[PDB]
Amino acid sequence: MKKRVGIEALAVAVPSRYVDIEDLARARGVDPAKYTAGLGAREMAVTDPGEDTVALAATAAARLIRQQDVDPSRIGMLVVGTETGIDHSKPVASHVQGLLKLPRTMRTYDTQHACYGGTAGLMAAVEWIASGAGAGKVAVVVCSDIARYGLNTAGEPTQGGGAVALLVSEQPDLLAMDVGLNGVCSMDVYDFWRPVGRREALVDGHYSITCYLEALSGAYRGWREKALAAGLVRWSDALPGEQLARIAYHVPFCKMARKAHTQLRLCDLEDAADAAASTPESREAQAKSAASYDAQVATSLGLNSRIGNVYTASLYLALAGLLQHEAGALAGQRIGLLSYGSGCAAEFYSGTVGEKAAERMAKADLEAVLARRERVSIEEYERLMKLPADAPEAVAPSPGAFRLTEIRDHRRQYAEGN
Template identity: 65%
Template sequence: MKIRIGIEALGVAVPRRYVDIEDLARARGIDPAKYTQGLGAREMAVAEPGEDTVALAATAARRALEGIDRDSLGMLVVGTETGVDHSKAVASFVHGLLDLPPTMRVYDAQHACYGGTAGLMAAVEWIAAGSGKSALVICSDIARYGVATAGEPTQGAGAIAMVVSANPSILELDVGISGAYSAHVHDFWRPLGHREAQVDGHYSVQCYLDALAGAYRGWKERAIARELVRGDGLVSERLARICYHVPFCKMARKAHVALRRCDLDGDDTGADASFREQVEPSLGLCARVGNVYTGSLYFALAGLLDDQAASLVGQRIGLFSYGSGCTSEFFSGVVAPRAAERIAAARVGEILAARARISVDEYERIMALVAPFDDTSAPGTFRFTGVTEHRRQYTSA
C-alpha cells in the first residue's frame, strides 16, 4: 500500500510592520530599480523586539492548528537559525505557549536555511515508520544584516507552520524520492554573540547553484528510476511548478536557469518562458515579506498555492531547499484535491493586509531597539514582553 504523507494544514505569521523597498532605496540614495528589478523585492518585513522567533513561530502554529485535534500530534520541530537561547529550544517555548500534549518529541533543527526542511523530512520519516501520529513543523526566522549594509534590502522576518500527517490535504510528498548535496563552505554564517550575519554574497550564490545541480541530479535519478517522471526530454518540465529557496526573489531566476542547464547540458534555451510559467507564480508572497531563512522555500509554496492551488490539483511540483554552509535537498509532491480550501483557511492575504507601512526613519529606530517598545498584541498573536530572572516572558491576545 502506498504511503501517503504530506502537508495537511499550514499557518503563516509576519511582523505587523513593513517598509516599502522603494522608500528604502531612495533613503540610501540608490535607484529603486536596483532593489525592485535587481532583487525582485517589493516590501520588507520589520520585526521589533516583541516579535521574536518564538512569538512568530507560536502565532503561525496557532493558526495552522485551527481545526486540528492537538492530541493527534506526537512531534514538534522548529527549524530556525535565529534562536533565542543557547540551550532551550524555540520548540520548547512554542510547546508551552500552545499547551500542547506532554507526550511529544520536541526539538529545534539548525543548519542555516535548511533547518525547516530537516524538520519536515524527519517528520515524514517518523510518520512513515509507523508513529501513528502527526507532526507540527515550524520554520521561524528573522533575517537581519544591519542598517545601510549591502544586505539590508534582503532582510525579512516571518514564520510558517505545517501540520504533517498521513492526511495530506494540501501537498502529498513523494516519500523517499529526493536528492541531497552538501559541502563545507563559508558562504554565510553568524558567529556566536553577533546579531547580524556575515555573508560572502557572490560566493554564496555560486554555492547555492552548485548545491542545486547536485541535489537535482539525485532527485532526477530517483524519480526516473521510480517512474515518477519520464526520462526523455527536459525532466524539469515534467514539474508543473518549482519552488526554490528564496533569499531574494531574483535568486529563483538564477536557480531556474541553472536547473535547465542541468537538463540541457549547459544550454538555457527557453529559460525566460519556463521561469514565467513554472517559478514566477511562487514569488508574490516572498517579494512582500523578504528573506525568512528557513521559511523562505515554504513561503514560496504558500504563495504559489494561495494563488493557483485550484488549477494545480493533481499536478506535481518541485521544491529546492538550501542551507548555507552548506546542505541542500530537492524533493517533490503532488497538490491535493483540498489544497485550495485549506490554503484559503490560512488567510494569507488578510494577514498581509493587516500590516502597517512605516517610514525608513521608523524602521531605523526599531532596528536600534533591544527591548520591546509596547505591550500590545494583535488578536491571535503572541508577543515577547521581556526577561524576568533570566526567563523570557510571552503574552498572547
C-alpha cells in the same frame, strides 16, 4: 491501501510592520530599480524585539491549529527550524509548546542548518510518520526566522522575518511527498554565517549565490536519478525538469528564483545524452526560457516579494504563494521543491498536490494575514533595529498572536493578544 505522507496544511505569521523597498533605496542613496527590478523586492518586513523567533513561531502554529481545527493531542512531534535561536539549550519548540498550552505526548526540538533547518525538520516528521512510528498522529514543523544583515550592508534589502507552520500527516492535502526520492548536496563552506553574539549575519554575497547554485545542481541531479528510476519523469521531447508542473525554490530575494530555475534547466541540458550537440550559448538561451519560468516558477513569489528573506521559511512561503492561487489546478500534479541553506546544504524533493489543497489554503486566509500589517518609515525601522533584544515595544499582540514582553531573571516572558 495507498499510504501517503506529507504536508496537510500551512499557516503564516508576519511581523506587524514593513517598509517600502523604494524608501529604503532612497535612504541608502541607491537607485530604487536595483531593489525592485534587480532583486525583485516590493516590501520588507521589519521587526521590533517583541517579535522574536518564539513569538512568530507560536503565532503561526496557533493560527494553524485554529484555522485547520487540529486536535492538539494528536501532535506527536513539534519541531522548529530556525537560525534565530534564543537559547543554547532550551529550544524554541519548547516555548511554543507552552505558549500554545499543548499536551505532553510529543517530541520537541529545534533543527539548525541556516535556511535548510525547516526542511530538515519536515523530513524528520515525514519519515517519522512514514516509518510507522507516527501512524495515527500529526507533526507540526514551524520555520521561524528574522533575517538581519545590518544598516548600510549589501544584504540589508534582502532582510525580512516571519514564520510558516506546516501540518504534517498521513492526510497530505497540500503535498503528498515522494518518500525516498530526495536528492541532497552538502559541503562545508563559509558563504553565510552568524557567530554567537553577533546580531547581524556575515556574508560573502556573490559567493553565496554560487554556492546555492552548486548545491542546487547536486541536489536536483540526485532527485532526478531517483525520479527516473521510479518512472516519474523521462528523458523525452520534454526535459525531465519540465515534467514537474511547478518548481518552488528557496527565495533569499525574488530574482534568485530565476537564477535557480535557469541553473536547474542547465543541469538537464548539460546531462542529456546528446549534450555534445549543444554549445554554452545554445544551452543558456534554452535554460533561460521565459516560457518555462513563467509556467513553473513565477507565481510562487507573491508573498516573498512583500516580506523578504525569512530564511528557513522562504521556500515554504513560496509554496504557500503558489498554492494560494493554483491549488485546485495543481491537484493531482507533481511539483518540485528546492531547499538551500548556507553552510551549506541543499535538498530537492517532489510531491503531488492533493485534491483538498484548495480547501486547506482557503482556510489559511493569507491575504488577511498580510493585510494586518502597517507601513513605517525607514527612520522608524532604524530606530527599532537599534533597540536591544531585551527591549520590546509596548504594544499588544493581535488576537491569538504572541509577543515577547520582557526578560526577567533571564526568563523570557510572553503575552497573547486578546
